[PDB]
Write a protein that binds this ligand. Sequence first.
Ligand code: ZN
Ligand code: ZN
Ligand code: ZN
Ligand code: ZN
Lengths: 315, 315
Amino acid sequence: GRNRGRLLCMLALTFMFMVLEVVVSRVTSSLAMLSDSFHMLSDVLALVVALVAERFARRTHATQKNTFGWIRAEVMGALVNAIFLTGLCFAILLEAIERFIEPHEMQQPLVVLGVGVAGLLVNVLGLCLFHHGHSHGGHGHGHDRAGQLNMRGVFLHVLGDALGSVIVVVNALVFYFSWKGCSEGDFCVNPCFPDPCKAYEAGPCWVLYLDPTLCVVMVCILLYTTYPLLKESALILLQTVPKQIDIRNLIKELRNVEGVEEVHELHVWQLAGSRIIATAHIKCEDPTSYMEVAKTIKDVFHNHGIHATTIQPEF
Amino acid sequence: GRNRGRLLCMLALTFMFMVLEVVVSRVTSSLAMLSDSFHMLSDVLALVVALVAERFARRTHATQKNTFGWIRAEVMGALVNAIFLTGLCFAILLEAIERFIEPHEMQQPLVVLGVGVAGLLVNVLGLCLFHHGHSHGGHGHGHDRAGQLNMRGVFLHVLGDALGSVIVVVNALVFYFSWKGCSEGDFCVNPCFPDPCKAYEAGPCWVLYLDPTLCVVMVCILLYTTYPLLKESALILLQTVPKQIDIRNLIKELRNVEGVEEVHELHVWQLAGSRIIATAHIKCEDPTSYMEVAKTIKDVFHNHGIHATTIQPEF
Ligand SMILES: [Zn+2]
Ligand SMILES: [Zn+2]
Ligand SMILES: [Zn+2]
Ligand SMILES: [Zn+2]
């Protein structure tokens, strides 16, 4: 409820800021603003993926197209958001390099500054806002993490953009305060800026390379903060034993338990969130005591937290 | 062996064509070629993430950080390649739109045509070249798909680029054969092309919008051919029952087996490739006949192909 509401609100606000950019470009007769319209198309794509994902994670029930259900869909949503952000980070880095090798000068600094401040406000609002395993429930004795991962994915995109907004605002301010370049055409020369199109002193060209370098630094930050989630997400999709559980201790402890000849094929794997699933085979001697033995076996897995289990007797 | 060899060969050839583009740009004093040097960073990135996938998928061996192995790592490699291609497709579409709204004219058509023909040859070479679940093996009676998915992922990128090379070559040819635009400056006017920088008849402007539209069409093709894999890959990561297996028939057939009145918690899920894993609970009356009953139970799962199983008795 709350999560879907937050995502829908941000998607709606994102469309509103898209319309604001388009109309501002229309009044100003500029096209790079329209280019900013498309970054907005990309934030809208992250938000829509995070959401298919919330509806779907909710169908936590035993369908027959998935005997397990869909919570893993939410983890995958987090994963794909992370991968999308990493791809956008690489494309941003390659644009930063392309602007380092080819400096780019912009026009109408005031409207750029205004749209950048508005985007900074929107992104700060988003960052403040976004701050059948038979497991989550039931003691589990028998005869929520995914939400955090999905929101951290959306939070990283919003942070990414926010850093983009900070870079645009700072660059526009530095241009307006410290760049005195010439465009009138009378006593006009651009020594630093190459490519002064076709055939006083211009502004300090060092400032223009202020834009690339910070962007590069920016992506590093994002990549750093992106790395744990895509690690965590790709391990929720690798059937790796969760870090809290160690298998060597489990094997020796199980065998310690009475009546148990062995264990073989112990697979412990983590479902989406805290729904760790473990299946085992346990050799015994007397099948009748097997049941009490199996309850002891359930007690072990249990101490270790694995409260969903299937342990074949293999007499 | 063969797969790692193909991937390493294409990565090496990709670096060679990167160096060729950089040196050609150096001789020609052009920078958009350097832009082509960067798409190359992306083809190289797919090729590396398709590989770490190959390196890991072979460690199919009961580790204690992952009790299943890493074949799922290969499926995830396929998945991430697909997602990367889809992201590049969206960015390409948004660049195509940005060039539709702002037409772009290029210089030095001959070197662009040569690099495009070389890239077309490289991409055609790549397309012709790239054309413990205890399941793959063992009868499995007891007391390779992932490679296709990973290569189809790499094949789709290579196809994507190949279509990019075809578009660049065709556009360069059409410019050289049907575009007679003016740049000398004497009896010179660009009516269609707006933004003729700062202050005869130019070439037909309809051709210049030839570049955007085809690109858009191109991405559609890619998206179409990309959709099944990312569906197939994201279901290998959703624990959904494989399409060949239906659960309703399985439940009734297991119930029809003599000595069984119950099944509960039937989970059937597909490991990476054809390593379908199914765990079940089966209630019985006489534990001694349970063993022969369990062999019958193994026969059922088996017919259905589920060749790894754990089936707790719950007497
Ligand atoms: Zn963004
Ligand atoms: Zn317990
Ligand atoms: Zn490519
Ligand atoms: Zn069989």
